[PDB]
């Protein structure tokens, strides 16, 4: 797999890892970004994490990677998708679903399973109190 195909599949894993810890406080992904082996996820959240709740994310991320879960893909019509899933899928349709972790209508090339992507390490986490946003830098090995 390409260095960025992997990277991009990580976005979904990291996202689900965020949802697990933050719960409802992960309001939505405002944006993402990919460059080489390095990625950035930006989420709208009320409060900021506490070092523990940052290691927890890198941990949940890597845990999902270590259980080599299938990155399920559905190419469904405009509707039908919405009945099967719903609001939780937005930021014909191409929907990427990591069972019980993340549902996302992404439109790019992904690895087949979480294993392929490999180890995820969180580099830096920035919070903007001004805007209510959480920025999460990471890269693969």
* Residues contributing to the annotated binding site for Zn(2+): 8, 12, 106, 110
Roughly how many angstroms between the first and final C-alpha of the chain, as a whole number? 13
Binding site membership: which residues?
8, 12, 106, 110
CA distances, 131 to each of 1, 43, 47, 81, 134 (Å): 36, 11, 11, 32, 9
Quote the DSSP letter at residue 70: B
The pair of structure tokens assigned to 123 is 């580099």
C-alpha closest to that of 74 among 54, 45, 52, 104: 104
Count the alpha carbons within 13 Å of 12 in the hemisphere toward its beta carbon: 35
């Amino acid at each position: 797999y390409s260095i960025e195909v992997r990277t991009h599949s990580a976005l979904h894993v990291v996202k689900g890892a965020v949802v697990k810890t933050a719960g409802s406080d992960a309001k939505w992904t405002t944006s993402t970004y990919v460059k080489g082996n390095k990625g950035v996820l930006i989420v709208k959240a009320a409060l900021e994490p506490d070092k523990w709740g940052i290691a927890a994310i890198e941990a949940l991320a890597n845990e999902k990677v270590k259980e080599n879960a299938p990155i399920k893909i559905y190419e469904l019509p405009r509707e039908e998708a919405e009945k099967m899933f719903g609001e939780d899928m937005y930021d014909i349709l191409k929907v990427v679903v990591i069972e019980d972790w993340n549902v996302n209508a992404c439109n790019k090339e992904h690895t087949k399973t979480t294993g392929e992507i490999g180890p995820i390490k969180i580099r830096k986490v920035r919070f903007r109190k001004s805007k209510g946003l959480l920025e999460i830098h990471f890269e693969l090995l």
